[model samples]
Target: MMLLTRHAKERIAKRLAKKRSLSHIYSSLWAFLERAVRIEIAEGVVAFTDGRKTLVCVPLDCERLSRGEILEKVRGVGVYECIFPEGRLAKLTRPEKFLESVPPGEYYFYMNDEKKVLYVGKRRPLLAITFRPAKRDERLFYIWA
Candidate 1:
């Protein structure tokens, strides 16, 4: 799995600042990603599987994350999943599908099978629903399959 670095935080922050709603979500998600990556790297392996292939490895402290904690963390944040090609610097412009695929749970995190980057986000019961764009020019959600 790809690790989050200070450089990744800077890059993500830059991209997210261009839109209002995305800013907070990006911050929380990146923070979580950085911590998760650090923990996983220190242990020596990060679980990853291509849609067509699978790899097995146990993660330390994986059971510490609970559904309630996941929900609380993601409630007010705008979750997003970004995609980029393997071994490439440019992000794919296509909408990310991971957001929609999120199962009904308190929290979950996964890496893209194809891109090999961690995608982190939280979910909770819907407080309200709106049709408006999250920000002036930003869509409320993005989905890629």
Candidate 2:
């Protein structure tokens, strides 16, 4: 089980805008945290392979996390950025261009039951890659993972 900070609870309440019973809110938040961490772990640094297949690499520092810490960071960041519109997060960039560049594939990063890291790759008809490119274009994408 993961614990949420008081600030995190407050933020969730504000974002969802529905008055949730304390217990319900806690449960929802916890579940969201779990999913977010799993997704992040499964999809590390999103990379484009030959510009045909998008590949995601697991971060080298990922093993340093405790489940509890992962939950907090994921929840915090999710709430902080949820309010912005989709493309707004990637400001000044063409959303369609980013989406178009993704190579068709199903890719993910995951942690095994024993906490060992793993990667899963699959082919898909259409792949979606969403990211904010650096202003100078020196870096392709930023890894918050």
Candidate 3:
């Protein structure tokens, strides 16, 4: 993934900032990405790839986390069976069929505590976030794409 991360950051830097490399803004960049996805919550950052060049790694304790926490979660977040049911009035025969009906684009995921929206997450550049190194969230509300 280092190859992908390195390449991803370069492309990101080109369109975003041709002169300044990420190494200037954050010294912990490589160390941050070293175990980004495996990190839970702390002086860590996480990102996932779909075998594509796009890199979306947000710090576990991002200040922007509240930006889209207004969205709702499915009856069972991340469960295909719940999103595409067999008994709903408009249910599809298969989850893939339901997915085919939707357009291809960025997806939003929110965190709920059985009551309200807690956090929202979408694809964002790794450098776009400000990882509060001195402080971090005690809990993690992952944003799945």
Candidate 4:
């Protein structure tokens, strides 16, 4: 039910029109905004996202700021800068691909079945993914899918 400014509509249309229907995109965007995390990676405008796609909102009737503000704000901790990529196409590598690409090593792997996400890293594995290797012969961790 939130209104999108002409510029905001244009931004979404430019990036997602070719990928999906505008009506669905708008609905999904609002839905995402409702649950997404808020961030201020740049001044004058705020950003919201689910870590994959971001919606940048600018205040109406406010004086405009230079685009350089974004560069200046992100100069140091710029990891999120990639979210403002060419044509605003933002996405992260798939967890499966990310895990498979890494060299063989002891890794912690956890899956969020509800979200269909697989989290992999070299830290504590939590409940499902144990850090220590288990084995029938006492040599390896058996991963049962």
Number of colliding residue pairs in each model: 2, 4, 0, 2
Model 1: residues with Cα > 4 Å off, grouped in runs: 6-63, 66-68, 78-99, 104-145
Per lDDT, the best of the predicted structures is: 4
Encode model 3's per-residue lDDT on 1-145: one tens digit a residue: 1212334444445544335443332323343443343323334555332222223444422233221222222233332311211111122133333444434434333232332222222432232233322212212322231
Q: What lDDT score is found at residue 67 in candidate 1?
A: 38
Which stretches in model 4 have alpha-carbon errors above 4 Å?
5-23, 61-145
lDDT of 1: 0.31
Candidate 4 residues 80-106, lDDT tens each?
201111122222444333333444543
Show the lowest summed lDDT stretch of 10 residues, model 4: 125-134
The candidates, ranked best first by lDDT, are 4, 1, 3, 2
Model 1, residue pairs in steric clash: 96-144, 97-144
lDDT of 3 at 62: 23
For all predicted structures, in order, the TM-scores are: 0.22, 0.25, 0.19, 0.30
| Worst 10 contiguous positions by lDDT, candidate 3 | 81-90
lDDT tens per residue, model 2, 32-124: 434332222244342322221122223432233333433333331211201111112211223223333334433331223232212122211
Off by over 4 Å in 3: 1-27, 38-127, 134-136, 139-145
lDDT of 3 at 50: 26
Error of 2 at 109 (Å): 30
Clashing pairs in 2: 42-108, 42-109, 42-110, 43-109
